[PDB]
Design a protein around this ligand. Structure first.
Ligand code: GTP
Ligand code: GTP
Ligand code: GDP
Lengths: 428, 49, 432, 33, 15, 430
């Protein structure tokens, strides 16, 4: 009765979502054949959120899995938890779309979104009280952006109060994995600003710096980047699925974040991560734990908060933990380091603690940060956009379905407005 | 005879330019490496997953 | 279920197919008969209920010598004999004979066969064209092939593994005439024309690989190696899968500018692979080297417009990103100003297989480059200078005009190349 | 109507849950336990 | 701010 | 971590290289093949076990390098680091800086730009050449110029076999040498120097072995390159990286030409019957009849020395030995050098290249010393260049192979400054 529905779009969205159901199957203890084989009763205490219940005693994840590329479709199907999914919400087309953002909204996106929302409607009207929707995708590919933002747009037509919790993957600062990534980013975030409520920005270069330096992992594969992403994935829904002395579902984690309806781009983070060679050299206490939360190194978005002010900050917590110092230390990080928080939000940072740990650590936490330093991530990509658009770099692929030059104008104008808002509230 | 004509024709400029082979693989490689079943270059042990 | 069809037209196209298809058979376990002793093979190999695998390929060639070689060779039981389309008399380096007189006779057969390939497949992905430039049926029949596949299919991706006539070495005396006229039909519906020559392979087979005296086979095995690396992601699971149409829509910046180069980095002998370390940071270092290039052109006199990186083997996304990062700051390689960071990466978990009797080692990792450069305008202009200098005194024209061609089609090719020369000048300039 | 596979057709407005699982009606079900 | 030096003082990390 | 790519250029270069990389391998237990039945600073690595070395052996004449590609040490070297030409430079610099060696400049610089890519902290390049040769005095000067433009501040040390005092094996030696010391004086952070005649004498007084061959001499030079790049490899108390040699031996800028002297050069009949101590070994390095460069140091004010002890050396003993050396007034030291001693100590004992002339000693000391007594050395060479140039002899060859007759005057002129510089850095302080 505070149920949320899962959404996966694009190859990056599928593999992140696949490894999310790897993780949730550990704290909820659901085996790859779906059955309960855990120990604690608190484990199946709020399983109704990410799962629906059972004919025969198993828990299929409520995850519609859309991707027009079938190569990632059987790749997740053949994974270790591809069996736990249901074949019904394996919605996919045999045809391919090579970063065709026009095709992803008007001709083949339109012919597929009816099939996709025929699944999403089934999983939304079948619940006592829907709390919201949440989607994981990439801003670079055409299926991550085109199918991603089209599903965000048409859901909001009939859902007034159900929040949308997008988990976004932004192109990297140093290099790109696709040359048309600024094009597929700018057009997609033109639909993310109006229609989403939380957009968690994940950066690949940020994940590399956490893995190489803090985790001391020389060769992190995609089974390791997604697990850091999946830590925050379960981190935002901690209190919603388990009891705590101060709970916070997604929706009081929304009003406590967004001052105005367009400032909803957040920095995710996981606090207690340390390399194997130095587990026994660092003491796991919440004074030590929340420092690694707030350093610029353990930030999953690759833009330095030192170049801006935090607007609103939360830190969700787990484990049997003292409430005095989690309250008194977040006094201390506000007040002694006060030039990097906005002065017009005095009681800036909130806490949201939980009684149960994750599987592996005695106490843990997950960082969410809404700062005005993320406009640099949007200022530099408008610069990456205005270099291509002044020469009409790759316009003739996008005009395959007759989307005009006029649509790119407000696509770029939405960013210049958004950056102008972020610079306006930087200086109050 | 052309089998003999190439056998007396070994210690030639055909040493460094044979037909399809590059030049006989023995003295530049340690003993018998089984060139079809050998995978050159270093790899990662892939520990600490 | 994703598949694409590879037609091999011309004597160069058949022999490339004669040496690349056994690499495709060795990469999935297909015996020379075709019985395997996993739906990976269902992108180039169809299925018969007996259990044996036909290649999804049609071989059309007017010359009967090279087609009857594979019918009487060790691949008699490899191809479908009705798919193996032979001709009667060859165009003989005559564009007007592959386009007008002899070519039009065999079009109704090859297009009917391609329709039969496309009819029995649930999802088609693209087209791979394999031809040359200096031929008669590699230049004229492929002109009919792209004029009719465009009207019959349309929005499907069409890719070409063509052979550019070398700037210094040549085979036929009339190569520039065919090479200015067969690019007229690749400027209308050819979606992405991969380019390679015959003499930069020679320097690669000499310096990097250690053979003197290379035949046609060693050239085409290498070409088979680089075709396989591009299309390995349509048949094998990878960390970042690339589709055939995904890199088609971002490697080509302008519809006229669809001529990327090619590069296979670890072209190393078995002796030297014991010796030199094979990390990811050195193979992508060797891609940008002008010596390790598959078209006789100098990259440092031009600007890279887009780059596609197709890795395979034991690579992880971190150290490839670090390697691209440290090589972008190198000043001797320069991009064009309006393009941002333009690399497109592709990762595959399948290492390259080595053919027995080959000249390459079993390397754990490899990388393919498809880079669209402004430097190829130097190759286009030199060929343009070769054509107009010989066309000024109207040489070798009566063979062309005597086989269904007008005098003006040479002129119509001239301003088409003038447009193809001016646009390369208009894309290399700075944006201000 | 073309795709319309049967598992998609089989929808619901109320969802059933097991006895450990806490529905709205869970205190209602332990009360008649 | 003016914590007592008679007991533990609690830490003061920056960003 | 630490890496020293060593471009061995010249015949003397590739021969010095052979002898040097032999000890360099018999010390890091790497068989002549490359597979071992800390060295990354002089031995790269594959995966299986191949420890392919790190070096660019270069010589424009396929004979003195084709033997390294066919002999015992064949597998070790990578067939792509032993670059070779097809035409000699004919002991004429003109065919080393302008012609003949203008085709190999690309191949070599590129093999280098790959040997470095693998490194993480190249601490410096060590060229090894011969001033009296052609390639040795040509592609050395050329490689030096291009290397600087590219690589950069990267230390460019040089170990050169400078023309002997009266002994020589070439008539055009004077020219090549004076011309090479003009296109290098500004592109070489430092330049250790050893002359053959001298090393012959030491292998007759100390190592009682008449009829010495260039191999016997190359072994002594090899056991000197070890005591310079030992700290970089083996561990020890006071360790000196290549960067320190450049800021402890070169006093003023242009004046950068350290000498050299190994000390426990003893036979076997001797070794056993003598208590080779840190004191006896120090004294040796300073005795004129033990300098690896025939230039009596008694006619010069030692600018700055740098004793590098290796083996079982107690740090206290070095303090004593040095103090006594400073006491004697026979050894003079410039006033502008109140200190003048870089004590380096590595625990790894000097190894004994089998079939050699040295005897397993428990200690050792190599003193790259800068004296104003190298002025006299360049004076002899300067004189034998103003003798022939006057009769404009052997200038027909050079001027024909690209070179212009101007660089000859320019060479003597620049060298005049170096001999006038070695005069001002030796005068008293008012
Ligand atoms: N890479 C490669 N190129 C080839 C090979 N054989 C021929 N070529 C090239 O093909 C060119 C000849 O043109 P083609 O298209 O093959 O000839 P054609 O159109 O079939 O006409 P015919 O030669 O009469 O059969 C030559 O210039 C060669 O460069 C080969 O085995 N490998
Ligand atoms: N220390 C030492 N010096 C050598 C050795 N071999 C030759 N030399 C000296 O090198 C001087 C001439 O320089 P080289 O390097 O031999 O001349 P080069 O120009 O390299 O000769 P090419 O490469 O054949 O053209 C001779 O006077 C020798 O004294 C050696 O093995 N060790
Ligand atoms: N963190 C993470 N990022 C991924 C993964 N797979 C792909 N990506 C990112 O996705 C981007 C490419 O998007 P793409 O897969 O082509 O999107 P699509 O074609 O629409 O499915 C690249 O920049 C990658 O960084 C993954 O497993 N983990």
């Amino acid at each position: 009765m505070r149920e949320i529905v899962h959404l996966q779009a694009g190859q990056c969205g599928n593999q992140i979502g696949a490894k999310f159901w790897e993780v949730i199957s550990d704290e909820h203890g659901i085996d790859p054949t779906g059955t309960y084989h855990g120990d604690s009763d608190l484990q199946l205490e709020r399983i109704n959120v990410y799962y629906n219940e059972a004919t025969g005693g198993k828990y299929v994840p409520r995850a519609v899995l859309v991707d027009l590329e079938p190569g990632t479709m059987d790749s997740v199907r053949s994974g270790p938890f591809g069996q736990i999914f249901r074949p019904d919400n394996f919605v996919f087309g045999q045809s391919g779309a090579g970063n065709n953002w026009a095709k992803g909204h008007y001709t083949e996106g339109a012919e597929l979104v009816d099939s996709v929302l025929d699944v999403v409607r089934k999983e939304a009207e079948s619940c006592d009280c829907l709390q919201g929707f949440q989607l994981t995708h990439s801003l670079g590919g055409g299926t991550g952006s085109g199918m991603g933002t089209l599903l965000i747009s048409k859901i909001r037509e009939e859902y007034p109060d159900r929040i949308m919790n997008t988990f976004s993957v932004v192109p990297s600062p140093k290099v790109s994995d696709t040359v048309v990534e600024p094009y597929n980013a700018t057009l997609s975030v033109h639909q993310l600003v109006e229609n989403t409520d939380e957009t968690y920005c994940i950066d690949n270069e940020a994940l590399y710096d956490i893995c190489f330096r803090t985790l001391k992992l020389t060769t992190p594969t995609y089974g390791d980047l997604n697990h850091l992403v999946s830590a925050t994935m379960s981190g935002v829904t901690t209190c919603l699925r388990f009891p705590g002395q101060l709970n916070a579902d997604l929706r009081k984690l929304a009003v406590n974040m967004v001052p105005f309806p367009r400032l909803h781009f957040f920095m995710p983070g996981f606090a207690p991560l340390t390399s194997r060679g130095s587990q026994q050299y660092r003491a796991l206490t919440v004074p030590e734990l929340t420092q690694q939360m707030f350093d610029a190194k353990n930030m999953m978005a690759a833009c330095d908060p030192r170049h801006g002010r935090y607007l609103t900050v939360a830190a969700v917590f787990r484990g049997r933990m003292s409430m005095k110092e989690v309250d008194e230390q977040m006094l201390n990080v506000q007040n002694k380091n006060s030039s990097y928080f906005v002065e017009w939000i005095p009681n800036n940072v909130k806490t949201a603690v939980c009684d149960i740990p994750p599987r592996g650590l005695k106490m843990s936490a997950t960082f969410i940060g809404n700062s005005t330093a993320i406009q640099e991530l949007f200022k530099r990509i408008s610069e990456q956009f205005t270099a291509m658009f002044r020469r009409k770099a790759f316009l003739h692929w996008y005009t395959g379905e007759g989307m005009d030059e006029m649509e790119f104008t407000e696509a770029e104008s939405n960013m210049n407005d958004l950056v102008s808002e972020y610079q306006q509230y930087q200086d109050a | 005879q052309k089998m003999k004509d190439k056998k007396e024709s070994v210690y030639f400029s055909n040493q460094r330019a044979p037909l399809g082979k590059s030049h006989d693989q023995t003295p530049g490689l340690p003993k018998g490496l089984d060139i079809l079943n050998t995978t050159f270059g270093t790899a990662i042990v892939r520990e600490t997953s | 279920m994703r598949e694409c069809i590879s037609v091999h037209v011309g004597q160069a196209g058949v022999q490339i197919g004669n040496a690349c298809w056994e690499l495709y058979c060795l990469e999935h376990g297909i015996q020379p008969d075709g019985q395997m002793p996993d739906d990976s093979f269902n992108t180039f190999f169809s299925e018969t209920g007996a259990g044996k695998h036909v290649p999804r390929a049609v071989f059309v060639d007017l010359e009967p010598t090279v087609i009857d070689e594979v019918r009487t060779g060790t691949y008699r039981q490899l191809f479908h004999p009705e798919q193996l389309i032979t001709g009667k008399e060859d165009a003989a380096n005559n564009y007007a004979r592959g386009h007008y007189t002899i070519g039009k006779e065999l079009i109704d057969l090859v297009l009917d066969r391609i329709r039969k390939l496309a009819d029995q497949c649930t999802g088609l992905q693209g087209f791979l064209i394999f031809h040359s430039f200096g031929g008669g049926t590699g230049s004229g029949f492929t002109s009919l092939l792209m004029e009719r596949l465009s009207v019959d299919y349309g929005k499907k991706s069409k890719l070409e593994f063509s052979i550019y006539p070398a700037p210094q070495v040549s085979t036929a005396v009339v190569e520039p005439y065919n090479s200015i006229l067969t690019t007229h039909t690749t400027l209308e519906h050819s979606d992405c024309a991969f380019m390679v020559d015959n003499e930069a392979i020679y320097d690669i087979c000499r310096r990097n690989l250690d053979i003197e005296r290379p035949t046609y086979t060693n050239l085409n095995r290498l070409i088979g190696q680089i075709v396989s690396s591009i299309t390995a992601s349509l048949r094998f699971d990878g960390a970042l899968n690339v589709d055939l149409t995904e890199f088609q829509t971002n490697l080509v910046p302008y519809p006229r500018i669809h001529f990327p180069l090619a590069t296979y980095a670890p072209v190393i002998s078995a002796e030297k692979a014991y010796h030199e370390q094979l990390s990811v940071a050195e193979i992508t270092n060797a891609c940008f080297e002008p010596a390790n290039q598959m078209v006789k052109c100098d990259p440092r006199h031009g600007k890279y417009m887009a780059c596609c990186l197709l890795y395979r083997g034991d690579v992880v996304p971190k150290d490839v990103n670090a390697a691209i990062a440290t090589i972008k700051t190198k000043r001797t390689i320069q991009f064009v100003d309006w393009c941002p960071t333009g690399f497109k990466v592709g990762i595959n978990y399948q290492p390259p297989t080595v053919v027995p009797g080959g000249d390459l080692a079993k390397v754990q990792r490899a990388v393919c480059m498809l880079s669209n450069t402004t430097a190829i305008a130097e190759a286009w202009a030199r060929l343009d200078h070769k054509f107009d200098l010989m066309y000024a005194k109207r040489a070798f024209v009566h063979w062309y005009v005597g086989e269904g061609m007008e005098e003006g089609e040479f002129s119509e090719a001239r301003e088409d190349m003038a447009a193809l020369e001016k646009d390369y000048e208009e894309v290399g300039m700075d944006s201000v | 109507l073309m795709e319309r596979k049967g598992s998609l057709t089989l929808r619901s407005h109320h969802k059933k849950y097991s006895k450990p699982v806490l529905v709205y009606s869970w205190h209602r079900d332990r009360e008649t336990y | 701010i003016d914590h007592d030096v008679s007991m533990f003082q609690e830490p003061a990390y920056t960003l």
